[PDB]
Write a protein that binds this ligand. Sequence first.
Ligand SMILES: O=C([O-])CC(=O)C(=O)O
Ligand SMILES: O=C([O-])CC(=O)C(=O)O
Lengths: 426, 426, 106
Amino acid sequence: ADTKAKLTLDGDTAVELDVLKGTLGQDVIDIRTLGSKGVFTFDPGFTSTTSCESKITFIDGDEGILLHRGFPIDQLATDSNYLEVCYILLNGEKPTQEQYDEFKTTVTRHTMIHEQITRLFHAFRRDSHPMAVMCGITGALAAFYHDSLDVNNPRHREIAAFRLLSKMPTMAAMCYKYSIGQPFVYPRNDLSYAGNFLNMMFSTPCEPYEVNPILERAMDRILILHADHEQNASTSTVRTAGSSGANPFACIAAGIASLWGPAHGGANEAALKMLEEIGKKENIPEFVRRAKDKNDSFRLMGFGHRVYKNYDPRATVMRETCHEVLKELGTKDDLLEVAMELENIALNDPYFIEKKLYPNVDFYSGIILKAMGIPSSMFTVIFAMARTVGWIAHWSEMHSDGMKIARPRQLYTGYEKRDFKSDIKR
Amino acid sequence: ADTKAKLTLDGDTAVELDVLKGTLGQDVIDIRTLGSKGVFTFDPGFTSTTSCESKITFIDGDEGILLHRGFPIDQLATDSNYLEVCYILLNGEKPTQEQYDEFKTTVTRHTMIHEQITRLFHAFRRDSHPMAVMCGITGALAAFYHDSLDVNNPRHREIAAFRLLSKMPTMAAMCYKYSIGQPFVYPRNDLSYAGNFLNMMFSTPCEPYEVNPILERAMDRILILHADHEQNASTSTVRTAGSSGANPFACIAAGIASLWGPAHGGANEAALKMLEEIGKKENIPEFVRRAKDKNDSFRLMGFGHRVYKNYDPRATVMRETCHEVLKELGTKDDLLEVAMELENIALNDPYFIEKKLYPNVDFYSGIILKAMGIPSSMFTVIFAMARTVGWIAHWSEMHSDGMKIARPRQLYTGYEKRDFKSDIKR
Amino acid sequence: TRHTMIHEQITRLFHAFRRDSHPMAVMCGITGALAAFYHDSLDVNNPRHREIAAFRLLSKMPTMAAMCYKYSIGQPFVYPRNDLSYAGNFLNMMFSTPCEPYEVNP
Ligand SMILES: O=C([O-])CC(=O)C(=O)O
Ligand SMILES: O=C([O-])CC(=O)C(=O)O
């Protein structure tokens, strides 16, 4: 907290700049004045620049720490439930009973989506990727919910939020049902947030569906563990679109697409096939399928991580949840020996050891969801669905900030003024 | 390098930073590696941070300078046409008759929209705002044209950029038609870009439509004048979404929603309400909307601009064209000479001279559109339609810089780790 | 109670109206189209005809009115239930959603 006093800069003149500090994490040099002075930095990507102050989530990557409103991710995972984590993320404090009661009633109150929005799904191809259908529908909500689009009105945000929060799962489960040809399942108030999702995902009218408390709690954990992850590509996208005035539904729609981005990204995308396909306990085990690794696309298959140095703090609760489920679903797991085998190769192969392609939270989330009969295409959908509450919090915090439409500068390197004379006559 | 030779970051040991210079504009300070030394700047609002290096468009706010690949907007809007200008923004140089004819040929052959998408149009409510439908449709494109979503594959990127350039006019016209209940019109390979769009907007099976030459030119100029505007908010959203690897259509959709953004509030349309809701001199102004304007109610009608200091270089030719259109139509303008009084007010009213609320390009653009018989609920759809080529160029550039991953950092000021104790239930 | 349901095709008619239309105009529209679906009871000179036409209008008007409302607010249609009263059934068709069994206050 010492040098936090101040510091200066100067190329042709003297400028005194303060050194701000956070409640956690390193200091920052407030350059909020250099602009006027006539001084501008150059940071493509905002790697050495801090774009905001936040009180939502704290991450210390080198130390594998993740906090949501101060609360460690591990405790919330085992001790809380998704809805309560939502409240905490959006409000900043654990909810009293009465507070959580109302929060849950409001949410349960608007889970249904306008029948006309439901008509939109039928205009997509049955062969479309459920993630693309997810972005499509979310990006159309504004044409149906035009009464809560003014982001300058607080009540507006309040409403828009509950709408996205209550309806995202109804929407995600519809994408799945449309992709496999089964009828849509309405939201039920008698079920939990997780139970209800499983219900809407798997029940048919041919027999009452019964949710296994084990798989349910497992889903609840998959959700809490993806609720929010500090600043990153998709959240920065939601923050930028937001401060540009864009309505809340459009902001979340862009967030979902940013989150999907790495996936239909190419080299990534093709290695996705290699995993979901090759696996005959001859390839994966004898490092055959892994004998091919030109394209890394590791974190995509659940290996390694960009922020956390040695391990993903969220992976602890999930691995134990994964163990549990795999046993609850009894002996119907033969091919899923590659699960045990890949983890082994991830922790015991010098390469992975050296390059640190350690199993992150998604490795186990993926194993859990698969064991449940959920197709891969629905993986990002469920993560985006869960991440929506975090996007709302960040978006709600970007507004409440100072509504300062961010306008970065550019270092113009192009052509100096030149006269124009077309070479065409058509 | 004027008032900036070299600079030294002072904390406890002088840290010299290299100053960079553009071909035009201000010089900047390099700070890319600072973070790699635990030193980060703080700057919410991006008042001093230069997010990128670009060669597309140059603006000099105080001088009212706007260039596209070095050419003065005035010159392009007068001696060129939209397509030639798209080629320039996209390719960096003016085309040869051969390059132009090749480019033009590729554009016209991708103008038709997939029939399945037409079904999606009919699922939206008939009273849907044209811009909302436009957002709804664009964000849904990735689900169909799924063969061009690999943002790192140069073949996919050109194919996507061309699809957008070809289809936007098509989708924009259909948004209009649908809102008024007239049948959709197909592109006309023999018509020019602007003439084709006017035909898709106003033709009907009842009889043949005649594209007025003066109106054809007025529209092309409006397009030209909205082709691109450097690093603004909507462009920032596009670039930021694109950094995460989001597909081309998702980014453009984000740009559209971003452009619509600052127009959702109540006082937003409440203001841009009487601007047209009344057509008679002594009524809208005459001791009326003098103070009857409440939050923005100025900047939304085409008065003032945070980029330019004295005037808008785009308004120049746009004002010239305005005359030609009113002149030409005669019986489709004259009633509408409430503009001259609005303009006069802004030129002499102490309140306007005060706020520098000078008539911008959108003041004159709106007059032309209101004269061609275009509803105010299509103005921003048209602006966005024209701006797409610019959004596309910027998206590409960012991808030329190697998909500049825009992931800023934060200054955390929330709770320090604290134990989670839940005594409630569900 | 025997004929409160309306032919599924007549039900398709509602979807051709705007969601923003006045429910009274949708009510006149649908009622004025019933003849294209119930062409067997149109001869007003036949007594049995009147008998039938009557029971049809009588049993189906509430099913129709509640559909107008549901279409106007974007909720799914609710079928007629034989276990309820004429009034109870109407309230049911007007307010119940599939998200929870609806209970009519006596
Ligand atoms: O890199 C990040 O912070 C994003 C992340 O892991 C996630 O979205 O699960
Ligand atoms: O305010 C800005 O710089 C953006 C702008 O005018 C435009 O998009 O035409």
